[PDB]
Amino acid sequence: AKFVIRPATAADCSDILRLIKELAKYEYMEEQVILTEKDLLEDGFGEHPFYHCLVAEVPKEHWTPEGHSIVGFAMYYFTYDPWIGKLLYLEDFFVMSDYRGFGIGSEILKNLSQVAMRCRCSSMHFLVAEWNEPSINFYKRRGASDLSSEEGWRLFKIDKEYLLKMATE
Amino acid sequence: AKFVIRPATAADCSDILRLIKELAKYEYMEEQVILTEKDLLEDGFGEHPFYHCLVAEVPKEHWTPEGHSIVGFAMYYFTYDPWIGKLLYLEDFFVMSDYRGFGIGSEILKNLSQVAMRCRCSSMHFLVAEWNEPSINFYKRRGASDLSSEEGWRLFKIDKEYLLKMATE
Numbered sequence: 001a002k003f004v005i006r007p008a009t010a011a012d013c014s015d016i017l018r019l020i021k022e023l024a025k026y027e028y029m030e031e032q033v034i035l036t037e038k039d040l041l042e043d044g045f046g047e048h049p050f051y052h053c054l055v056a057e058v059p060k061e062h063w064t065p066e067g068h069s070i071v072g073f074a075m076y077y078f079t080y081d082p083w084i085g086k087l088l089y090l091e092d093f094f095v096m097s098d099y100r101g102f103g104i105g106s107e108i109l110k111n112l113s114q115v116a117m118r119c120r121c122s123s124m125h126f127l128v129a130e131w132n133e134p135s136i137n138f139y140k141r142r143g144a145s146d147l148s149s150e151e152g153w154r155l156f157k158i159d160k161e162y163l164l165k166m167a168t169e
Numbered sequence: 170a171k172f173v174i175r176p177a178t179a180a181d182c183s184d185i186l187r188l189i190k191e192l193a194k195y196e197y198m199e200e201q202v203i204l205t206e207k208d209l210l211e212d213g214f215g216e217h218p219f220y221h222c223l224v225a226e227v228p229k230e231h232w233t234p235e236g237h238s239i240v241g242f243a244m245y246y247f248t249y250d251p252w253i254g255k256l257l258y259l260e261d262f263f264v265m266s267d268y269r270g271f272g273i274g275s276e277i278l279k280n281l282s283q284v285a286m287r288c289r290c291s292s293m294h295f296l297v298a299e300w301n302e303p304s305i306n307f308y309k310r311r312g313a314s315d316l317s318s319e320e321g322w323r324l325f326k327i328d329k330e331y332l333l334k335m336a337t338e
């Protein structure tokens with residue numbers, strides 16, 4: 001199992017979208033990926049980066065059925081807390097099926113931790129679906145706290161439609 | 170009741186920390202604000218901004234007991250979604266007790282909505298405590314969805330200590 005975890009470059013954006021679309025097809029809710037390869041380039045590889053990705057890369061031998069070298073990714077960005085400052089936020093990660101079980105996910109997790117030490121982050125935040133007890137227990141074994149269950153936080157969103165109203169109300 | 174909502178400047182950071190400490194004093198959970206005025210400056214007014222603040226400013230007429238012109242704030246940043254791209258994230262906002270009830274809060278909400286259109290955000294995410302039924306209903310009346318209730322999302326945290334292990338193991 002030879003792989004490397006490295007930062008994404010602009011040349012990796014096609015691979016990241018491909019994997020985002022495989023993640024979308026994977027996860028149970030049925031939202032569609034509106035995001036384009038150009039969006040990914042603009043938003044991550046333009047001026048101010050709105051996300052950062054780590055990428056899992058394999059050598060020619062282990063390339064996919066369609067000739068791809070990228071088999072996994074993590075997406076993260078930096079957030080802020082008024083009590084304790086800068087935080088690392090983990091948005092998602094995914095490893096392709098035939099490449100699971102070889103320490104990629106774990107190795108991805110290691111490199112995120114290094115991002116958080118480097119960048120002086122006090123915590124790493126992320127969402128886990130309540131129904132996903134294997135992933136919950138996984139993260140608790142690693143020292144995670146469930147802040148929804150401890151402090152009662154619920155995630156809300158106001159959609160573009162209603163923000164339009166409010167921007168003019 | 171005259172007031173203006175405006176972007177924060179470096180000269181506002183002392184007021185922001187003060188209001189943050191008043192917010193902490195308000196919150197029911199008891200956590201020490203570890204952030205300094207210097208943190209706020211480096212993190213918000215250095216090279217890369219990790220947060221953005223909107224500030225409520227009153228004329229000399231209604232300045233505070235200790236002689237301050239800043240009577241409320243909002244803290245926000247930009248986050249990312251692999252399906253749909255850039256989002257506006259509302260971290261917190263707070264208005265001083267003697268200045269509540271004059272439209273500042275709603276006017277802050279209004280200006281955040283403008284930020285979301287100017288930066289091309291598809292929605293605005295924030296957290297609400299499940300116990301806070303007045304806030305929940307307030308936000309619903311404005312078209313907010315509860316994504317924890319609908320999709321089962323829970324907020325997780327792995328804090329500095331365990332990230333330390335993972336980054337070195």
Ligand SMILES: CC(C)(COP(=O)(O)OP(=O)(O)OC[C@H]1O[C@@H](n2cnc3c(N)ncnc32)[C@H](O)[C@@H]1OP(=O)(O)O)[C@@H](O)C(=O)NCCC(=O)NCCSCC(=O)NCCCNCCCCNCCCN
Binds near residue numbers: 093105
């Ligand atoms: C789980 C994997 C990532 C694991 O990677 P690898 O196979 O390389 O792992 P290792 O070889 O190191 O294995 C080590 C062992 O530990 C367990 N192991 C290792 N890692 C794990 C994890 N992570 N979980 C459970 N078990 C693990 C694993 O089961 C092993 O155990 P063994 O018994 O030894 O075999 C992968 O299988 C994969 O990609 N799976 C598909 C995705 C998935 O199911 N879960 C991803 C949850 S992480 C996601 C996360 O943290 N935040 C994202 C949520 C945020 N969303 C918000 C939605 C909002 C946006 N949306 C809007 C649009 C609407 N639509």
Ligand SMILES: CC(C)(COP(=O)(O)OP(=O)(O)OC[C@H]1O[C@@H](n2cnc3c(N)ncnc32)[C@H](O)[C@@H]1OP(=O)(O)O)[C@@H](O)C(=O)NCCC(=O)NCCSCC(=O)NCCCNCCCCNCCCN
Binds near residue numbers: 083262270296297
């Ligand atoms: C609520 C106010 C902001 C209101 O602003 P104003 O007074 O200017 O309001 P208006 O004059 O415009 O409008 C008046 C009417 O609208 C209602 N009106 C207006 N707004 C509201 C709201 N929001 N709710 C209810 N009613 C409202 C209000 O009840 C009135 O009603 P009438 O019947 O018309 O008279 C203010 O009172 C205030 O700052 N209060 C203190 C803070 C507070 O209680 N809530 C803030 C919730 S927003 C927070 C938010 O979105 N995410 C924060 C969660 C993130 N946490 C993550 C944890 C991370 C930190 N981890 C460290 C460890 C912690 N230890």
